[PDB]
Structures are given as C-alpha cells and as structure tokens.
Nucleic acid binder design. Sequence first.
RNA 1: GACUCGUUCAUACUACAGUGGCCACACCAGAUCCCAUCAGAACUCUGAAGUUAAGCACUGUAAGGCUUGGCUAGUACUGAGGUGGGAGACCGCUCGGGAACACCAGGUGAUGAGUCAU
RNA 2: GCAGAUGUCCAAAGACAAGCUCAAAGAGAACAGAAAUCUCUUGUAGACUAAAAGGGGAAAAGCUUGUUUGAUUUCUAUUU
RNA 3: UAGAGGACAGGGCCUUGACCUAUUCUCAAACUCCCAAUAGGUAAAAAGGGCGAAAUAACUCAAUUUGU
Lengths: 252, 155, 66, 124
Amino acid sequence: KVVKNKAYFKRYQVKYRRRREGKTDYRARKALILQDKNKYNAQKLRFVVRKTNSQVICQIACAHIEGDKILAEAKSKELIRYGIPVGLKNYAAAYATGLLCARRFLKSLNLDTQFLGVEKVTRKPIKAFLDVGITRTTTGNRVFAALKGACDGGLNIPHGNNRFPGSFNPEQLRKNILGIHVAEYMKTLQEEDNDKYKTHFNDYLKNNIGADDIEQMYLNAHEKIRQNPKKLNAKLRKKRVKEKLALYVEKL
Amino acid sequence: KSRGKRSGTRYKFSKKFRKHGECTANKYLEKLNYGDYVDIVCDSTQQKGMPFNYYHGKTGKIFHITKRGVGVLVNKRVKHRIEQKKVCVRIEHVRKSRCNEDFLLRKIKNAELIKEAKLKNEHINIKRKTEGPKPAAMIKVPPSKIITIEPLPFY
Amino acid sequence: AKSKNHTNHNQNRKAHKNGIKKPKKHKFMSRKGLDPNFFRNQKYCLKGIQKKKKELKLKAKQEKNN
Amino acid sequence: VMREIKVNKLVLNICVGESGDRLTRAARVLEQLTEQKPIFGKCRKISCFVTVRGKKALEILEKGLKRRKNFSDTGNFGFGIGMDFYVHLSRSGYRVTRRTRRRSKISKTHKVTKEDAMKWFQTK
RNA sequence: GACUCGUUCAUACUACAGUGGCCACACCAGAUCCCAUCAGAACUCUGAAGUUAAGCACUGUAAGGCUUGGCUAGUACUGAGGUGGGAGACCGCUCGGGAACACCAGGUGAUGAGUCAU
RNA sequence: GCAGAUGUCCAAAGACAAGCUCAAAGAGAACAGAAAUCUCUUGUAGACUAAAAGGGGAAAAGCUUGUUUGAUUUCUAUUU
RNA sequence: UAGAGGACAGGGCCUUGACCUAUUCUCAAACUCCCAAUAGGUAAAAAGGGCGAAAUAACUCAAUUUGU
C-alpha cells in the first residue's frame, strides 16, 4: 500500500509558509501582536532578536496588516566598526547589539538625550516586548543578553530574572555581558594545551585579542556605541518531450 | 426534545475543506470602532466567545468593545416584531462588514464630483442610475457572421 | 383524546396583521454596564466641560449685570 | 566531498522482559560497558538500553566485531552474542532533520541506502 | 546576489533529477563556563579547520496535486402559471434562475517593511 | 418517528508554561515468535482528547515534565 | 460487481489464494471534493457625513499633547 496516493495529496492541507519553513510560531506571534481592542493606535512594539550561527540580529517590529514595519535594527557584524572584531555570536556580542538596537531606535525617535539608560554594567520609557523566535528560553540564553542590552539602552522590556545565568546572580550576569566566560575559557585552554587553544581561538590570535583584553575592549565598545549609534513554457516543453521520445525510439 | 446551544450546527460550525486550523495572525490586527457594521461568522476553532447558532452570518453595528470581545447589536425576528439583541462575541468570530463599502466609496466619489461640478457651475445627477432600457443602435455585422438556426431533430 | 400537538399555521398572518414591528432605534443608549474606566473618564470630561462653560457664562453674566 | 558515512548512533539493548534483580544486573553490566546510565523499557520495566556516540561508539563496535544479510534498507544493521547491538549510521548534515529551528528532510541522494552501507562495513 | 520580520496560506505542496557560492544562510569544530540529557543526538554555550554533500535558492518532469479558463450544458435541478398531457408513475409548455463530476488547455507564484554585500 | 445518550466522572481528567508528536505500515536487531523492547523511513491525524453523537484540535486542545489552586470573593451588559 | 497486470502463506517448475497497481457495475435521512433555484440578512446621507481649529479628562499612549 502507498499512503502518498493522489487522494492523499488532494485531501492534504498545507501549513502556513513560515510554519512550514520553521521560521515563526504563529501562536507566540498572535499573542505578541494582539492588542486590547479598547486601545486604538497602540502598536505594541516587539523587540525581535534572532541568532544565526555566525552573528545575531536585533530589530524593533510594529505589526501591520500588509506586513511588519521595522523601526530599528542592529547586526552583530556592525560591531567591527565599534571595536569588536571577533566573537560576534557571543553573549557579550548579543548584549552589545541589543544596546545598539536600543540606541539607534531612540536616536531615530529623537529621544537619546531624554532616555540615557544606564552607565557601565550593574516620563515613561518606550515599551517593547521580547520576541523569542523558536529558540528555547533556557537560563543564560543570548536572547536575554540582548534584552539586557536594550534595557540598559533605555527601552522598557518587561522581564524576569530567572533566565539570566544563575536561577539571581548580577555578578555572573556582568561577567557574561563583559565576556569574562570567554576570557576564562582562553585561560583554561592555554594552561591545559596550547595547540587546541591556538586552533580554537585562531582569528582571536590573528586579531591579537588577549584573554585579559576582552573585558576592556567590550567596555570601550559599549561606551563608543553609546556615544555614537530559467523557466520553460508549454511550447518548448512539448518540443523537448517530442525530441526526447524520438531519441528514445533507438536509445534503449 | 433537544435544544442545546449547538444543536443543529453539524455543518454550519464545521470548517471548510482544507481550511481548518486556528485563525490567521493578521485577523487580530483588524481595526474596530464603535458604531460600525460587523459580520458575525462563527469560527469553530475558537470555542470561547462563540456566537449562538442563529447569529451566524448576521450583521450588526458594534455597541461595545472590550479587551478581546465585541458586543454587537443584531435584529432578530420574533413572531410579530423585530427586536434588538446584544450579542457578545470574541474577536475571532467577528469581521468587518462590507455591507457599507459601496456607500462609503459612493460618498467619497460623489463628494469629489460635486466639488468640481459646483466649481464649474454645472447641474449633475448624483443619484444612482438604476439603468433600464437601452437606446436604439445602428449595428454592422459581416454577412459571413450571420448563421441560420433551426431546431434540431431528435436522436 | 389526542391533541393536535403543534402547528405554525396562521402565525405568519397574525404576525403581519399588525405588521412586523421594528425597534424604535433611539439616539442614546444607556451606558450602564459598558466600558468602565472609559465612561467614568467621559463623566469627568463632561463635568470639566460644564464647569468651564458655566464659569465663562457666569463671568459674562456678572460683567453684563454689574 | 563530505559524503563520508559515520556512525551516527550505536545502541545496546538488553530485553529480558521481567522484573528487577536480573534487570538490575543488566543495568550494571551496561554501566561498566559504557559509563552512561541506561534507561528502561515500558511498564504496561522489561528491558534496558543505552545509546552512545563518538569514539566510544567505534570502540564498542570494534568490541562487537568478534553477516551481510541483516542490513536494513535505510542503511543500518545490528547483531547479538546476552546483549544486542544496533548501529544507525548516517552522513554529515543529519542535524537538519533533528534541529528545531528549520527542521527539514535530507534528499535521498544524501541518504545512505543499504548498498554503500555494506561497502562501508566491509571497509571497516 | 543574500538575510530578518511578515502577507497571501499549495500557482506556494509532494516525489525524483540537475545547477549554485566571497561575506550571506547553513552544514561544520568543541564541551570550560550558563544550560541539557542515557546520549553536547537535541537544547545551551564557545568557536571558524573544512564543505556546497545536504538544508536553502533556481530550474527541469508527455510527474501527482493544486489553481484559472473552456467544455460538460442551458444538461441536472429549480421559483411562478396552467379547467396542461398522462390511469398513474411521471413529462411538456409560458414567464424566470441555473449546477456538479468527468474531460481538455494554460500556469506552478506574487508581495510589504527593513538590512547586508558588490 | 429513527440511531443513541444523561441524573455521572475528575487535586486532576482543573490553571499556566515548556518540550515533544500521534495511529499505522515497511525494513533491520540474541533469546524473541503474529504479536514484548530498540533503530531508521513514511506518516494531515487514519491516534488521543472521561462518557453518547456531532463539531474543534499538530512547535496542539494530544503525550511528558515543572510550578500551582482562577474549581476564589463581589457586581454588571447580556445569549439560549 | 467483475475481471486485468504485478515480488507473503499451502501442496504437488506448476497449482490455491492473499496482497499491491490501474480499472469496472451499482448505492447512502443520520456520507461529502463541489453545489444551485427558492428563502434570509445588512446598507443605500441632515438629531447625520466630511474636513479643520480650540477646549475637557482621573481614560489611553513612550507622549498635558500620542490617541480616544
């Protein structure tokens, strides 16, 4: 028996395109974007953070019928001009790009001078809601690094403290935000075998980013970014099948 | 002997072929205001806030809006009189009614016509035309196009 | 004996004898149980509007009556 | 190319079908065989098993080396001796079908099939 | 050329085959830390040696499906009239409305906001 | 009139969240067989959802896990 | 209801089938891919609509000037 019969195909109903591709949830989305029907012209901005396996991206999205409007965005690859040439997928990189998205959004709205956020690391501000994006919200996930970046940048993104590294550890949070975990990984690898360390943090070395230099370069990056943000048709199809069968007459 | 809430809704409250599944995310973005007309179509995928059997497919103007619900005022025929009924449903079971769209477009177009007509000092008929009898026409047709028709024999 | 259980016969004629009455469709509907925290705010709006309007009218009346 | 078949998974199974004592003995023998703690079967508790990966999979496969008709049509095989071996081998890129984000299917060209599974086995 | 968030929710799906890669996605290297398990498979974290093999994109198939039109067909059915026909079952006529399956042909997408690379 | 069902059941079978995907089939693995467990492939639900039947349901409304008591007090506009 | 083509089970290369594929005759008030006719509902402007300014609010919004 074959379950792929034409009756099966005829009765089959497809999922939404984005669900089919796995990109979106459509259950989280429809609760992120659904706003109280009492309130008119309230957009309910969502802070969308998506991490690729090379870099992470943050943006501010406003839901609209014709499609989402992106009010601000930030990519990890933009940290090169801010002084971070490597580790753009890091927890620290996620914090930095969340900071970048927040600062750029505030600048575009012309409210930097009025919402300074915080300094260093530990009227009502703009409210945005964190968009997960399929990833599992485990403790110490990079989406919450991006959320902390935006919160320090001045956005009011509601959040709990459970999923920062440590179920609360502000010291551990600051260490991961400043990349201390990467630094201690460098130290452990160096002290245990040099070859694996060199082959692992290769372009770290090629950029001569020492383990002790990571925290300072991330702080400098933070202050700098804070201060400046071909088809075929039926005719030739029939022609090609005709010639195909003409050759197939004697081919096999 | 059976008059439950959903009695006799075997087909009315069933999803269309290959159209199952929850409501689209974009439907939650629909804009609703007080006093505008709205259609009541029951979405079986959402159970809470479901309208009664009778009001499926009816139309009425919104008289109340809540966080996730709409109270819409619907005429119901009861024996010798119509009476107003306030039905409270959720968002998924309500949709913007196109019962007014021709009127709204007519209002806009007629306004921008009346403005120019008054500007040029012209008298125009703004009412709809209810077109009837066509005028005499003087039509030409090739002789090779006229074909003779006669009733066919039986077979 | 057996009773005629049911019929809708002549009911439509009875209904149309006095016509199918339509609802009166008044201009204002009571807001007794609709959108609190909105109609309360509307009450405050209206109270302020009357306060300002009446105080302007009282000022005009006083300055015209000396 | 990166079309090298590698041992994706190696599962050891003890199906005794009864209560503990012997089940506990099976659990501990699997325990020193591989330090991973085993899991149990159904409780309609009848069997215990473990799946391993990495270098240990190859080591235990070498231990089990000591036929050519028991290969599955999807490119797998297994045997016995009491204990039971099964090995699920696959090419690289199999993560596509197991990850959560953009889970998809691999083309049947990239699938292993039985014929080259036999060649892989006889080459190892 | 590519990506993120969407819209439409199969013209978008499915099967097989071919073509494509510098950043772009991704496969991929690893498990100290956050985290996670029988299992670093997954999830999470840190990476940048390798590869378009796969995902992905594009195309192809006398491909299935889906979709548009034609045709089925003024057929089936049906509103109103009849001191119409017929023993009846049923069937015309007058004023009107009017399908479906199947078959044939074409097609296999389009698009909003933002961003990256040249 | 026709085919049935009710006077119950549930601290979870209620609430929320997360993860997962079911029935079945095929192929393969000592005991091990038509059936017992494991792996892979296909799998639009052909399972499951307390009960009758009909609707609804696939990153769920199903399965598993975690935390819980919103199965709480009071009052409206209302539908059948 | 019938045959047609095609690699699991019994006996003596063959027999008996099962099963699969494409067909085929005929049906459903408690079947549905599709789907009429008739019946039904809403709308078709003046106590209103459109377009602006100014006030009011304890509402809403990041916004005493966002919106309502």
